[PDB]
Amino acid sequence: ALSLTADQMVSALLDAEPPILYSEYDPTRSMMGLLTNLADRELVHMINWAKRVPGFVDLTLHDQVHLLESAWLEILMIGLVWRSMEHPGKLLFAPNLLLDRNQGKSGMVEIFDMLLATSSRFRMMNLQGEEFVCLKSIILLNSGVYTFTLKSLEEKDHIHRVLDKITDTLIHLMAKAGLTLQQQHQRLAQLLLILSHIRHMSNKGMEHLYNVVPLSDLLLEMLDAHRLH
C-alpha cells in the first residue's frame, strides 16, 4: 500500500473506478425520487470502490464506516461534476438523465448551480482522469480524518501516510505532463482548494436530505462482508 509507485497508484485507482449507472425510469413514458434511487444504487458500488483504494482496507471496520459516512456525498458530487465536464450548463446524473439548471429549479437549484460552477472550474483547469481519481481518493481518506486511543493514533497516521503518497502521485502526474516545479505546487493547490467547495456543497446537500436504519449501519453491513463469495 505504502510501497506502491506513482504509476502503480494511478493504475490501481483507475481500475477501481465504479461504473456509470442509469436512472431507473421508462424512456417510453418525480426528479428527487430519480436522483435518490440513483444515489442509493451508486452507494453500493462506492463501497466496492472504496475497498479497492490502496490502504483503505488496512483500516478497522469502524474507521472505514466513519470515513465513508463523512465523504459519501462529496464522492457522489465530484463524480457527477466529473461526468458533466463536457456538458456545459448541464449535469449528467446519468446518460439517460441530463438536466439543465431550469430543470433542477422545480428547494435546491442552489446546489445545482454550485455543482455546475464546479464543473466549469474543472473544465477551465482541464482536469485529467488520473487527477480526478486522485482527488476522489483524497476526499475518502481526508473528509472524516479530523472527526474520529493508541489504535486511533496508528489509524490516523496510516491515513495521513497514504494521503502523502497520493500527493506525491499528483505531483508526478504534473511533472510528467511537463509542468515546471512552480506550476506543479500551484496546480496542486488549485485542485485541493476545490475540495473545500465540494465539502461546502455536501454540507448544503445534507442540510436538504435531513424511521430508517442509520447510514452508519447500512455502511457497516455493506463493508463487513464475509469471504464466502
Ligand X SMILES: Oc1ccc2c(c1)CC[C@H](c1ccccc1)[C@@H]2c1ccc(OCCN2CCCC2)cc1
Binding-site positions for 17beta-estradiol? 42, 83, 208
The verdict on 143 binding a second copy (CB under 8 A) reads yes
Residue 144 or 205: which CB sits closer to ligand X? 205
Q: Which stretch binds a second copy (CB under 8 A): 34-42, 76-84, 186-194, 221-229?
A: 186-194
Picking from 67, 58, 59, the residue whose alpha carbon sits closest to that of residue 145 is 67
- Closest contact distance (angstroms) between CB of 78 and ligand X is 9
The verdict on 87 binding a second copy (CB under 8 A) reads no
Residue 42 or 74: which CB sits closer to a second copy? 74
CB atoms within 10 A of CB 204: 14
CA distance 196 to 207: 17
The neighbouring-strand residues paired with 205 are: none
The neighbouring-strand residues paired with 211 are: none
* 181 binding partner (options a second copy, ligand X, none; Cβ < 5 to 8 Å by kind): a second copy
Contact yes or no for 93/35 (Cβ under 8 A): yes
Picking from 229, 221, 226, 219, the residue whose alpha carbon sits closest to that of residue 67 is 219
The verdict on 34 binding ligand X (CB under 6 A) reads no
The verdict on 108 binding ligand X (CB under 6 A) reads yes
* 2 binding partner (options ligand X, a second copy, none; Cβ < 5 to 8 Å by kind): none
Contact yes or no for 166/138 (Cβ under 8 A): yes
The verdict on 194 binding a second copy (CB under 8 A) reads yes
Q: Which stretch binds ligand X (CB under 6 A): 22-30, 72-80, 141-149, 165-173?
A: 72-80
Q: Considering only residues 45, 200, 220, 223, which one is a binding residue for a second copy as defined by CB under 8 A?
A: 200
Q: Which residues bind ligand X (CB under 6 A)?
A: 35-36, 38-40, 42-43, 73, 76-77, 79-80, 93, 108, 111, 205, 208-209, 215
What is the contact surface with a second copy in residues (CB under 8 A)? 114, 117-118, 121, 138, 142-143, 146-147, 160, 163-164, 167-168, 170-171, 181-182, 184-186, 188-190, 192-200, 203-204, 207
